[PDB]
Amino acid sequence: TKTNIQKDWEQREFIEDMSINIQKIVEFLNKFELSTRNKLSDLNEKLTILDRQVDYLEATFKT
Amino acid sequence: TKTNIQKDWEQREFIEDMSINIQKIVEFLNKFELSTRNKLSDLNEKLTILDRQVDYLEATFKT
Amino acid sequence: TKTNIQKDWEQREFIEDMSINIQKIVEFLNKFELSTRNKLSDLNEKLTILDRQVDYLEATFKT
Ligand SMILES: [Ca+2]
Ligand SMILES: [Ca+2]
Ligand SMILES: [Ca+2]
Ligand SMILES: [Ca+2]
Ligand SMILES: [Ca+2]
Ligand SMILES: [Ca+2]
């Protein structure tokens, strides 16, 4: 119960919307890779600072 | 060596399968973003607990 | 100002390129999930080693 013109418009919109969704996925991955990398960086940095604090406490106690 | 009917069916299946694959990617990203966020949460929480333990040990030793 | 032959070629290339981009996204997700999992592993392992070091220092001090 759609005309050929309506059906063709809908089929093209479906394909156009996939092109948009693929771009939205790529943009999300760019943001999420950066976010994740920064968070991992920050955790590593905090662990490195705490490791130094523990090694100094060891040295102060053992001496 | 395919009829027009077979070729048209295959071309449509190809496009339909892309729509399904994009949805599978979106569902995976939803799960993976949540997983990653929770794991990062848990590591931060464990580091915060260990930091408190180290600061208390410092205070007990220095005093 | 394109012939029908040119327009049909371009429309098919557009759809073919989406199939390629979806595969590139899947390949990236495979690599990024593995990378992220390994990095999280490594942070957990480093925290577990530092936790053991802190517990031993506690035991040595308290005794
Ligand atoms: Ca549109
Ligand atoms: Ca349109
Ligand atoms: Ca189908
Ligand atoms: Ca079909
Ligand atoms: Ca091509
Ligand atoms: Ca082609």
Residue numbers in the entry:
A (entry chain A), B (entry chain A), C (entry chain A): 3 to 65
Please, what does the article write about this entry?
The Scar/WAVE subunit is kept inactive by various interactions within the Scar/WAVE-complex, which consists of the five subunits Nap/Hem, Pir/Sra/CyFip, Abi, Scar/WAVE and Brk1/HSPC300, in a 1∶1∶1∶1∶1 stoichiometry. Brk1 is important for the stability of the Scar/WAVE subunit in different organisms, and was proposed to function as a precursor for Scar/WAVE-complex assembly in Hela S cells. Dictyostelium DdBrk1 encompasses 68 residues and shares 37% sequence identity and 52% similarity with human Brk1/HSPC300 (HsBrk1). Here we present the high resolution structure and a biochemical analysis of DdBrk1, which provides new insights on the question of how Brk1 may function as a precursor during the assembly of the mature Scar/WAVE-complex.
As DdBrk1 does not contain any methionines that could be used for selenomethionine substitution, and no molecular replacement model was available, we co-crystallized DdBrk1 in presence of heavy atom salts and collected a 1.5 Å resolution data set of platinum soaked crystals at Pt-peak wavelength. As DdBrk1 was crystallized in presence of 0.2 M Ca2+-ions, it is very likely that the anomalous signal of calcium at platinum peak-wavelength was sufficient for phasing of the relatively small protein due to the high resolution data and high multiplicity of the measurement. Thus, the refinement of the dataset of the native crystal was performed including two Ca2+-ions. The final model depicted in Figure 3A–C containing one DdBrk1-molecule in the asymmetric unit (residues 3–65), two molecules of MPD, two Ca2+-ions and 107 solvent molecules was refined to an R-value of 0.159 (Rfree = 0.182) and showed very good geometry. The DdBrk1-chain forms a single continuous α-helix and assembles into a triple-coiled-coil (left handed superhelix) with its symmetry molecules along a conserved hydrophobic patch. This triple-helix is stabilized via typical knobs-into-holes interactions with heptad-repeats of lysine residues with an interface area of 935Å2 between the single helices. Hydrogen bonds between Q55 of one chain and D57/E60 in the neighboring chain further stabilize the C-terminal triple-coil domain like a ring, as also observed in the structure of the actin-binding protein coronin 1. As the helix shows an approx. 20° bend at K33, residues 3–32 are opening up the triple-coil to form a funnel shaped N-terminal region. The entry into the triple-coil structure is highly hydrophobic and occupied by larger hydrophobic residues with additional stacking interactions (F30, F34). Residues 33–65 fold into a compact triple-coil structure whereas the missing residues of the N-terminus are probably flexible and thus can not be seen in the electron density.
